[PDB]
Structures are given as C-alpha cells and as structure tokens.
Amino acid sequence: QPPVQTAMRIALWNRATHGEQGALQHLLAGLWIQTEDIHPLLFFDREHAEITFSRASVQEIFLVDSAHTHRKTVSFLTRNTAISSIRRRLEVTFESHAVIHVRAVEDVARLKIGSTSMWDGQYTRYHA
C-alpha cells in the first residue's frame, strides 16, 4: 500500500471521479512538472488562488479570476500580476490524481490568441 497522503489524493480523486464533489481543484494545489531539456513548471497556489509559470529564466504569476470544473477538466481564467491586459486561459485535464494534461492560450488586450504554447503538454505532480 502507498503512503498516507498519497491515499488521500486517491481518496480525494475518487470523490471527483463520479462523485462530482465541489472541489477537484484541491488535487491541483502543488507543484507540477512537465513530461517530454528544461521542464516547464506549474504551481497552483491554492491559498492565494494563483498559478506560477516557470522555466528557468522564465518566472511569472497569474491570479485566478475564475475557475470551473466539469467532469475531468478544470478551466481557468487567469490574469498577469503586473499587467491586467495580459491574461491566460488554461485547460487542465486530469488523467490521474497526479497526472494531468494542460493546454494554455494567451489573451492580450481582449481577443484570445491561441497557437501552441510552451506550457502545453503532460504534467506530473511532484512527490518524494
């Protein structure tokens, strides 16, 4: 059997699988490292409702203006800390309690512009 906290994630996961309980987001809270060089990183700061985007020299935060769960997908509308003009849409699709797939789309000024992103790809939550 796995460690305690690990089971809690699976327990929490089960409540979101068919349970469709309020929070699937609770599984996102923490550090996520991209799969497939230097790995892009996502940290979902639950306390401050932020999402920090990192890749070496690249580091930046977007405050969550909204967040909605549907089935197995959390859809974020985030906004840059410095400039309100620059925002970012996220499509976090869970595969497992510690495995997701992210799609990101920038939104400068007010029209969303959506080619492939450096943040697009599979992520796995960090565990020691």
Author numbering: 96 to 131, 138 to 229
How did the manuscript describe this experimental structure?
We also mutated Glu199 to Ala to stabilize the protein for crystallization studies. We next crystallized and determined the three dimensional structure of Tp0751_78A using selenium single wavelength anomalous dispersion (SAD) phasing to a resolution of 2.15 Å. Structural analysis revealed that the C-terminal domain of Tp0751_78A adopts a compact eight-stranded antiparallel beta-barrel with +1 topology, capped by a short 310-like helix and a longer N-terminal helix. The first ordered residue in the Tp0751_78A structure was Gln96 indicating the N-terminal residues Ser78 to Thr95 were either disordered or proteolyzed in the crystal. Analysis clearly revealed an intact N-terminal extension present in the Tp0751_78A crystals indicating that the lack of electron density for the N-terminal residues in the structure reflects disorder and not proteolysis. Comparison of the Tp0751_78A structure against the database of known structures using the DALI server revealed a striking similarity to lipocalin domains, specifically nitrophorins. Ultimately, the classification of Tp0751 as an outlier lipocalin domain, as opposed to a kernel lipocalin, is based on the observation that is does not contain all three SCRs. The SCR1 in Tp0751 localizes to the 310 helix and Strand A, centered on a GxW motif (Gly125 and Trp127 in Tp0751). Although SCR3 is distal in amino acid sequence, residing on Strand H, the key basic residue in this region (Arg226 in Tp0751) stacks on top of the SCR1 Trp and forms a hydrogen bond to the backbone carbonyl of the preceding coil. Although Loop 1 of Tp0751_78A is exposed and partially disordered in the structure, there is no discernable hydrophobic pocket, primarily because Loop 7 caps the hydrophobic core with a stacked Trp-Met pair (right).
